[PDB]
Ligand binder design. Structure first.
Ligand code: HEM
Ligand SMILES: [C-]#N
Length: 136
């Protein structure tokens, strides 16, 4: 993960970072078992909560932290440590993590011309999830 790839990803993310709700929607739609871990959304129709205030509040938190991580590549270890600390006790599985990745990438492909940033995003996400999976 070098500066050329980091700059490509950060340019790519800048286009979409203003649509937190859309990104979270994509992730929940890829794997409903992620959605079911939230007391505030469990048992509701995703299409119905997508536009409510609680969804936006959450979306802003999660994508806000992801935005931190993208902004500081590649010095992400301390933040991944924090993530593992808050999430390992909620029983997040590798399957769910991989579906989050799949949902995010699906979002990016449906909303930008992804083809030019694909390999850079690959390197970034392989590095990120590579670190998470070594800790939980
Ligand atoms: C895909 C598996 C994941 C599951 C099952 C999951 C689950 C949760 C749950 C249950 C909460 C608490 C919501 C609340 O009580 O209000 C939460 C919050 C949060 N999640 Fe995740 N999450 C996942 C992935 C991620 C990823 C990849 C990130 C990295 C950006 C992330 C960042 C956050 C942040 C920043 C919060 C708010 C602070 C906190 O409560 O921990 N989550 N998540
Ligand atoms: C966490 N989403």
């Amino acid at each position: 993960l070098s500066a050329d790839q980091i700059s490509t990803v950060q340019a790519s993310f800048d286009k979409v970072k203003g649509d937190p709700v859309g990104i979270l929607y994509a992730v929940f739609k890829a794997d409903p078992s992620i959605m079911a871990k939230f007391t505030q959304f469990a048992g509701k129709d995703l299409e119905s909560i997508k536009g409510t205030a609680p969804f936006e509040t959450h979306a802003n938190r999660i994508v806000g932290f992801f935005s931190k991580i993208i902004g500081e590549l590649p010095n992400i270890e301390a933040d991944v440590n924090t993530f593992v600390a808050s999430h390992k006790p909620r029983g997040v599985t590798h399957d769910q993590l991989n579906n989050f990745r799949a949902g995010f990438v699906s979002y990016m492909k449906a909303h930008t011309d992804f083809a030019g940033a694909e390999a850079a995003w690959g390197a970034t996400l392989d590095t990120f999830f590579g670190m998470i999976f070594s800790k939980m």
